[PDB]
Amino acid sequence: ESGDERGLIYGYVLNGRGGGRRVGRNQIAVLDLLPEESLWLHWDRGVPEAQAWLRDSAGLSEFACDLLLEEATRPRLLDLGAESLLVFLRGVNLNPGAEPEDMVSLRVFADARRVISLRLRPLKAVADLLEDLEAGKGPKTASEVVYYLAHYLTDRVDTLISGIADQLDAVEELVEADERASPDQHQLRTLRRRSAGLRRYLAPQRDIYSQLARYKLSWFVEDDADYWNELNNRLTRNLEELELIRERISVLQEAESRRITERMNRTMYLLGIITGFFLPMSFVTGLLGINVGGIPGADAPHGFWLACLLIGGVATFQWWVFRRLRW
Amino acid sequence: ESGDERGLIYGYVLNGRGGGRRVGRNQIAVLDLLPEESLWLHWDRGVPEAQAWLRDSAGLSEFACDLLLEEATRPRLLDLGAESLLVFLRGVNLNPGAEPEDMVSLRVFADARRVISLRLRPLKAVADLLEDLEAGKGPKTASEVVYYLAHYLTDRVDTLISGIADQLDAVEELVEADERASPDQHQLRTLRRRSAGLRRYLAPQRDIYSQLARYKLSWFVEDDADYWNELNNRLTRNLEELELIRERISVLQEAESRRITERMNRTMYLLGIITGFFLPMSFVTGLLGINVGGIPGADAPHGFWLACLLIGGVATFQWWVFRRLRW
Amino acid sequence: ESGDERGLIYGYVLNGRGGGRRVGRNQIAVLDLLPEESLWLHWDRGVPEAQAWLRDSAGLSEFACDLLLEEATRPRLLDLGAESLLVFLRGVNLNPGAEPEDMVSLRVFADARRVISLRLRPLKAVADLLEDLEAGKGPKTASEVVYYLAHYLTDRVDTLISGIADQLDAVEELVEADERASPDQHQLRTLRRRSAGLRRYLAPQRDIYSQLARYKLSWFVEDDADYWNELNNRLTRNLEELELIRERISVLQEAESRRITERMNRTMYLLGIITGFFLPMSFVTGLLGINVGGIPGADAPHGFWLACLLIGGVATFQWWVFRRLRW
Amino acid sequence: ESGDERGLIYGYVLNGRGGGRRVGRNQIAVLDLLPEESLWLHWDRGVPEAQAWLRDSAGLSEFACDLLLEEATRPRLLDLGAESLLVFLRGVNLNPGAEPEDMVSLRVFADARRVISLRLRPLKAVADLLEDLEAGKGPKTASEVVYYLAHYLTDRVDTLISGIADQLDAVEELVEADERASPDQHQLRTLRRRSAGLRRYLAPQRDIYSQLARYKLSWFVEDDADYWNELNNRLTRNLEELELIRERISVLQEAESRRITERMNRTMYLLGIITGFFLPMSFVTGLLGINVGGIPGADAPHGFWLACLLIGGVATFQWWVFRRLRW
Amino acid sequence: ESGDERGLIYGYVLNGRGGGRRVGRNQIAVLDLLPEESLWLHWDRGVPEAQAWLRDSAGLSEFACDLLLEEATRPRLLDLGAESLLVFLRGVNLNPGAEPEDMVSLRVFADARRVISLRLRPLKAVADLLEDLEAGKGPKTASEVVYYLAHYLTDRVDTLISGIADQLDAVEELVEADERASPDQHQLRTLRRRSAGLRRYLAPQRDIYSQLARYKLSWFVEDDADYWNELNNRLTRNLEELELIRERISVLQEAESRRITERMNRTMYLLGIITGFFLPMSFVTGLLGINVGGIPGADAPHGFWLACLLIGGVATFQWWVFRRLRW
């Protein structure tokens, strides 16, 4: 906000009614009123002042701090003691640079009255949640904040996967509408890479959601148990779609390979025809007589009765190999 | 019926004895008599008035309404509270357009005394159930309606799979009856696509049926537990048939690829023969004498004793490479 | 027997001591004495009078009758109520027509004092059991009849699988005894089809036997529990042999494909040699002098000092490409 | 021993202290003293007198006798009643004939005070155990005899697998030390066959050992429970090594196939070069002038200004296709 | 230390506060004070005096001694009695020789107050732990020593796997940045070998860590239960990365094979073009007239009206096969 900010991207105190207020860098001195309003803090994991405040503030165990300030992580849920669970989520990387896969990683520390979220590269889901909040229809408690974040991450991953599916649909309909048209490589490769890199991170998030759906009594009240369950369902459906997409890509690749091999065989057949017709014919014409037509007026060759038997032999060979080429 | 209908395809109050009656758009004022007769409503999921009535009528939780008015779904059973389970089923798409796979989706909300079914594209199973009903031999309670719908969906999926099997049988018997005959591509591809798209939706329905068969005490009385079990069995058998069909298609594809590769090798062999016979022979005839037979009457060549040794060398080379080509 | 029979193939009342007696079509009026003797009925599932009697006689639930008069089934065991289990078994189809796989289906309804068996195509196991019975050493109770049927079905499936194994052994020993000999296709294909079609039905029968072996206290007394267990073992062993046979067939196929590809490469090498030796040599001889030896007695060419440098260039090219072909 | 023996290979009464004594064919009249010494009998499963004595002696249930006198078996453990378990083990076939895989089968009937072992083809492990015994350091009870047999069978299977691994190591180091050197086929094939045939029988023995390790309280006192456990471990390690060996063989095969395909492409490239250089050049020289150098002293051709434009066209074609061949 | 050492690499008595002291070969006479300080001994498994002392000292069961002085082992945890567990770990082999895979094996015997570690080839993790210790910030109890060893082994295995990933990234970005550039073989092969040899040993260590994380109450106090759990997590992540790396390598290999096959087809097409254009044209020029231009001034050929029809036939053939080659 006004003045320079150390590491705090979005400092927003909730309201308990979907509303809220931004607090900015002067948040160590907030006195939250009766416990309906949570407090949300979005931190830049790269800025060293963020890690500084994160080490000594809001009383996090040094184990926890070291657990969400790592470099490489995989999606997982982690409960540490009567409160304070840790969730490691993966965005979908709609950054101006590239690569929808290679998913941005979002790390959440969920308390009963605080949520602290970490990221390196900006996420869309967080801006969605923010504009949701100041619109007066956002979440109202910590569990609701985590649910909104997960919901938006999934609402974008499924959009991406449906886009991949329509891309494959266009490729296929083009390939089969035309004929002897190869599918555009360097696109099937990118789609395969994308499906693999998506599954690699979506497989553990489904389990995160399943775990968040089963009991999680005190933290994330079962009011949202079925919501977490249907998020689990949506990721299951998306993984099914990913496997179907991979199998469709493999079918396209096998079809293309078979096509080029059959075309190879066809051109080899034509090559054999061209040779076997002309190589002998160019040899038998070797001992042929005068190569100009009708030397003595009526009939060009004279004395042919001796050696003319050769034109029959190469003709027999030709028709033999021709029947030998057909079958 | 008479007058214009908002979204209600089939409004049919059951009878408890297989009979029933159609009610039409004036159904908010039905007073069902003593509880033997259910009430069935088939809605068009696309018409906005259907979703309008569905939001505020028959007292469905907003969660439920939002759960069966989605766009993309996968087959699953869902129990929500002492009553009112939700089933998401997949037809087989016998629509005039195309594609037996890409299965029509049927979504059922089953109560103890009401069934509400949703669809976008028309389904055969529903017309089957209707003509069954007004024939006086249809279902008589809600569980029976859901069972009839599932039974008809399966009675058509197995017909489709047996059709696929006979198609593969015809293809194979043709291929092996003839010889060097390639199987009709663009048909093996469609059959493979069909098997994959069928399995993608049949794998969860088997689990739906298994779940509906295990306890489901209060809702779907165990009178039909064994019926749901045998529906589970039939889908298991059909999935086995689908895997067998996929493996048969893969065998046909490998056979065709091997055939074209071996034919490629054969035509390359013939090409090598044609060249290795004539390329040397066309070279040794280069320094040959007069290309017309018997110049000095008796014997055509003169002075051959010097350079005639060459015709032996290329002949040795020819028989060498010929023995080198055979083995 | 004497007189015309409606649908009853083998009507044989057991004895409790392995013996028995045939009853024929007049069996509705048998009064079985003190309960040591069962009653066996082998029915033709196709004859409509068999299904007629089967609907209303021996008091079978209409669900049961409809369950074993289906068209397509998979092997499974099915218990229905304090008695009366249903077993669906698969023979091995030693019929004069064809196809050891595509196994004949045998459907058994086992009671405490009755066995009713159904089939379309004749089975060997049943004739085995019959000739066993009238020999005085057959079964003596219902469980024993079902066990004998299963035992004979397995005694024939393992014979078939061992035959397949010896066939593969002969094929392999021929292929490796000789060299550059392709395995007989259209036989590897049939063996692969046979293994697949056998496994498709043997996988559920193993589970049938396991289930029949675990408790089945009242029906099939544990006197035969270990016998059912060893039948389970034998089918497990046969499935292991089937997987081993499939892997051996795949090894043979890969060996053949590698062989034809390497032969293809070899003939391409020979083709390149034939061309690269003669194509240049046939070109350099183009500007060669008189193609007859020793024109001016001593040395054929005159004035060669100008253009004779060319015979070195094509020779350098030849030895270059020859060294380029070797490595 | 002295006199002729019916079927008893090794008749050795143990001692309880690792020692013992051979008894020979006169063993029906041994009166074992206070129960520290077991009694071991190694029988030839082929000799009919062995099966004769085995049917009626040492009081084995006819079920048991029929269970270990079968023809085809798979490795399994089998407990039958308060005593008397049955183990079916597989040797490694170090017989002078051939085939380390195709493992000799050893069948053990273990009592609390008797061990009876059956075999067709001689086993090394048994001679090991014998020379161990008369050395004064052999087993002392029945469980110890079975453990020694299993221990020796494993000590030889792992030797064989390590030999396979070093063979693959030598093959690989040769292949990569040299270049364009194909791996010795007919050896990779034997190693693959060997790994498959070893796994086929080692997979169930691991389970035999695991079962023998879990409780087996009364029979095989838990004094050896951890020993059976580490035997389980050793077979697990050997199966891991077998899978690694199979994957290494597959890598070698793919490398060889890629190598021959790339060499095929290379020789095709050289063939295309040889033709495309000389086929046009041999055609343009067709209408060339006098093929001898310098006819009118200074410059050989006369009147070339009309048709000399052709030598440019085929040169353009040549450089075109040459650039078309490179890229 | 000073004087010659028999087999003891690192003899270091801990301190209970991260500190400690080296003891050297005179350690049989240490009297550890009140039980906060453990005692660590790193032994060379090859030196026979190490195995000598290890057989009779620190009171290890002969079973244990024989269990960790084996030759071939796989990673596993092993508890033997109220104390004294055995862990078999695998380093990453950063030895000057070669092969990051083929991992050095570290074998630990963990007591409540003693740790005894064995190795053949030197390990980095142990030097790390040592320099950690004498820096005053090392472990302080036995469980902490085992945890530090495992932590360092993992901190190096993940470094190696990330290096493999960046190597593949460089290879891919090169391949796709350029075009028709083959990936560097003999590097993809080494990376595949490395991934396989890493997984072969990392799969059991993950289970070691999971087991060490679940209860292990008395030995390895649950103070480190979550630490062992996150070590389990890190190995799970690394195995995921290994599978992703293998799939990326397979994609690169398939892309290269497709590229060489398509280039093969392209050069075959060019070869067919070169022949089919010139082979006929070189034949029709056979009977062509004078090969010098304009013999009678105005028009070179005379009498062509008879046989000139041939130049049309070979031209028709040429354009036919050309259209036959395109499609």
Characterize the bridge pairing of strands C115-119 and C105-110. antiparallel
Radius of gyration (Cα) for chain E, nearest Å?
Answer: 36
Residue D13 DSSP class: E
* Backbone φ/ψ region at B188: left (φ over 0), alpha (ψ -120 to 50), beta: alpha
From the list D95, A46, D204, the residue with the least C-alpha distance to C237 is D204
Do E183 and D258 form a contact (C-beta atoms < 8 A)?
no
Q: Write b or e for each residue in C227-263: b if 16 or more Cβ atoms lie within 10 A of its Cβ, otherwise e.
A: bbbbbbbbbbbbbebbebbeebbeebbebbbebbbbb
Evaluate whether chains B and C are touching (3 or more beta carbon pairs less than 8 Å apart).
yes
For E127-172, give the secondary structure using H, E and C. Answer: HHHHHHHHHHHCCCCHHHHHHHHHHHHHHHHHHHHHHHHHHHHHHH
Same domain assignment for residues C175 and C309: no
Other beta carbons less than 10 A from residue A166's beta carbon: 9
Whether C306 and chain D come into contact, CB under 8 Å, resolves to yes
Same domain assignment for residues C211 and C307: no
Do C86 and C142 form a contact (C-beta atoms < 8 A)?
no
Q: Do A275 and E271 touch (CB under 8 A)?
A: no
Residue A34: φ, ψ to 5°: -45, 140
Whether C261 and chain D come into contact, CB under 8 Å, resolves to yes
Do D327 and D286 form a contact (C-beta atoms < 8 A)?
no
Other beta carbons less than 10 A from residue E193's beta carbon: 17
Q: Nearest-CA distance from A273 to chain B in Å?
A: 9
Same domain assignment for residues A129 and A226: yes
Write out the two tokens for E17: 């506060």
Q: Do D321 and E274 touch (CB under 8 A)?
A: yes
Q: Do D251 and E192 touch (CB under 8 A)?
A: yes
Whether B278 and chain C come into contact, CB under 8 Å, resolves to no
Chain D residue at shortest CA distance from C240: D200
- Give the helix, strand, coil percentages of chain A, each rounded to 5: 55, 10, 35
Q: CA C286 → CA A38, C301, E41, distances in Å?
A: 96, 14, 87
Same domain assignment for residues B12 and B72: yes
Same domain assignment for residues D252 and D310: no
Q: Nearest-CA distance from B93 to chain A in Å?
A: 19
Characterize the bridge pairing of strands A115-119 and B77-79. unpaired
Chain D residue at shortest CA distance from C257: D257
Q: Do B226 and C80 touch (CB under 8 A)?
A: yes
| Residue B71 within a domain | yes
Characterize the bridge pairing of strands D39-44 and D115-119. parallel
| Residue B272 within a domain | no
Contact partners for chain A, using 3 or more CB pairs closer than 8 A, are: B, E
Evaluate whether chains A and E are touching (3 or more beta carbon pairs less than 8 Å apart).
yes
Report helix angle E225-284 to D310-326, nearest 10.
Answer: 160
The CATH number for B165's domain is 3.30.460.20
Q: Nearest-CA distance from D67 to chain C in Å?
A: 9
Write out the two tokens for E91: 């380093």
This structure's resolution (Å) is 3.0
User: Taking a contact as any Cβ pair under 8 Å apart, which residues of chain A between 145 and 174 contact chain B?
Assistant: 158, 162
Chain C residues whose CB is inside 8 A of the D253 CB are 254, 258
Burial (0-12, 13-18, 19+ Cβ within 10 Å), E51: middle
Of D226, D261, D286, the CB nearest to E260: D261
Write out the two tokens for C166: 């010896």
Whether D63 and chain C come into contact, CB under 8 Å, resolves to yes
Whether D261 and chain C come into contact, CB under 8 Å, resolves to yes
Q: How far apart are CA C223 and CA C324, in angstroms?
A: 78
Chain A residue at shortest CA distance from B73: A237
Same domain assignment for residues C93 and C157: yes
For D49-77, give the secondary structure using H, E and C. Answer: HHHHHHHCCCCCCHHHHHHHCCCCCCCCE
Do C65 and C46 form a contact (C-beta atoms < 8 A)?
no
Whether E291 and chain A come into contact, CB under 8 Å, resolves to no
| Residue A83 within a domain | yes
Q: CA D80 → CA C226, D65, D87, D205, E294, distances in Å?
A: 9, 12, 11, 19, 108
Task: Give bridge partners of residue A119 from the DSSP assignment.
Answer: A44
Whether B264 and chain C come into contact, CB under 8 Å, resolves to yes
Q: How far apart are CA E178 and CA E173, in angstroms?
A: 8
Structure obtained using: cryo-EM
Place of tokens 């148990």: A225
Q: CA C210 → CA C226, D73, D265, E12, distances in Å?
A: 10, 18, 56, 59
Whether A277 and chain B come into contact, CB under 8 Å, resolves to no
User: Which helix (H) or strand (E) covers residue B21, if one does?
Assistant: strand B21-22
- The CA angle B12-B16-B22, to the nearest 5 degrees, is 15
Torsion sign, CA atoms D219, D221, D222, D225: negative
| Residue C264 within a domain | no
Whether D72 and chain C come into contact, CB under 8 Å, resolves to yes
Q: How far is CA E184 from the centre of its chain?
A: 17
Whether B287 and chain C come into contact, CB under 8 Å, resolves to yes
| Residue E327 within a domain | no
Residue A12: φ, ψ to 5°: -130, 115
Report helix angle D225-284 to D188-214, nearest 10.
Answer: 160
How many helices, marked H, and strands, marked E, lie in chain A?
7, 7
Write out the two tokens for B234: 């039939």
| Residue B190 within a domain | yes
- The CA angle E109-E115-E116, to the nearest 5 degrees, is 60
Q: How many domains does chain B have?
A: 2
Do C10 and C42 form a contact (C-beta atoms < 8 A)?
yes
Whether D292 and chain C come into contact, CB under 8 Å, resolves to yes
Of D260, D282, D292, the CB nearest to C265: D260
Residue D11: φ, ψ to 5°: -105, 100
Query: Domain range holding E36?
Result: 8-258
User: Taking a contact as any Cβ pair under 8 Å apart, which residues of chain E between 170 and 199 contact chain A?
Assistant: 176
| Residue E133 within a domain | yes
Chain D residue at shortest CA distance from C282: D282
Same domain assignment for residues C142 and C174: yes
Whether C308 and chain D come into contact, CB under 8 Å, resolves to no
- The CA angle D28-D31-D36, to the nearest 5 degrees, is 120
Q: Do E325 and A285 touch (CB under 8 A)?
A: no
Q: How far apart are CA D255 and CA C225, in angstroms?
A: 52
Q: How far apart are CA C206 and CA C239, in angstroms?
A: 9
What lies within 8 Å, CB to CB, of B168 at 6+ separation is B191, B245, B248, B249, B252
Whether D217 and chain E come into contact, CB under 8 Å, resolves to no
Whether E296 and chain D come into contact, CB under 8 Å, resolves to no
Q: How far apart are CA B157 and CA B238, in angstroms?
A: 8
Same domain assignment for residues A187 and A114: yes
Q: Do C272 and D275 touch (CB under 8 A)?
A: no
Characterize the bridge pairing of strands A77-79 and A21-22. unpaired
Q: Nearest-CA distance from E42 to chain A in Å?
A: 30
Chain B residues whose CB is inside 8 A of the C292 CB are 287, 289, 303, 307
Q: How far apart are CA B185 and CA B165, in angstroms?
A: 16
Q: Do B251 and C282 touch (CB under 8 A)?
A: no
Burial (0-12, 13-18, 19+ Cβ within 10 Å), C115: buried
Q: What are the strands of the beta sheet with D77-79, ordered from one edge? A: D21-22, D8-13, D39-44, D115-119, D105-110, D85-90, D77-79
Q: Do A261 and B263 touch (CB under 8 A)?
A: no
Characterize the bridge pairing of strands E77-79 and A39-44. unpaired
How many helices, marked H, and strands, marked E, lie in chain C?
7, 7
Evaluate whether chains B and D are touching (3 or more beta carbon pairs less than 8 Å apart).
no
Place of tokens 């017989």: D95
Q: Nearest-CA distance from B44 to chain A in Å?
A: 24
User: Taking a contact as any Cβ pair under 8 Å apart, which residues of chain A between 91 and 110 contact chain B?
Assistant: none
Other beta carbons less than 10 A from residue B97's beta carbon: 8
| Residue E279 within a domain | no
Chain B residue at shortest CA distance from A269: B267
Same domain assignment for residues D200 and D282: no
Q: CA C204 → CA C121, C243, C284, distances in Å?
A: 21, 16, 75
- Give the helix, strand, coil percentages of chain B, each rounded to 5: 55, 10, 35
Whether B200 and chain A come into contact, CB under 8 Å, resolves to yes
Same domain assignment for residues B189 and B313: no
User: Which helix (H) or strand (E) covers residue C276, if one does?
Assistant: helix C225-284
Same domain assignment for residues A208 and A250: yes
Q: Which of B68, B73, B74 to mutate to test the interface with A (most CBs of A within 10 A)?
A: B74
Same domain assignment for residues B246 and B291: no
Q: How far apart are CA A138 and CA A15, in angstroms?
A: 10
Characterize the bridge pairing of strands E39-44 and E115-119. parallel
Q: How far apart are CA B47 and CA E82, in angstroms?
A: 72
- The CA angle A215-A218-A221, to the nearest 5 degrees, is 70
Whether B322 and chain C come into contact, CB under 8 Å, resolves to no
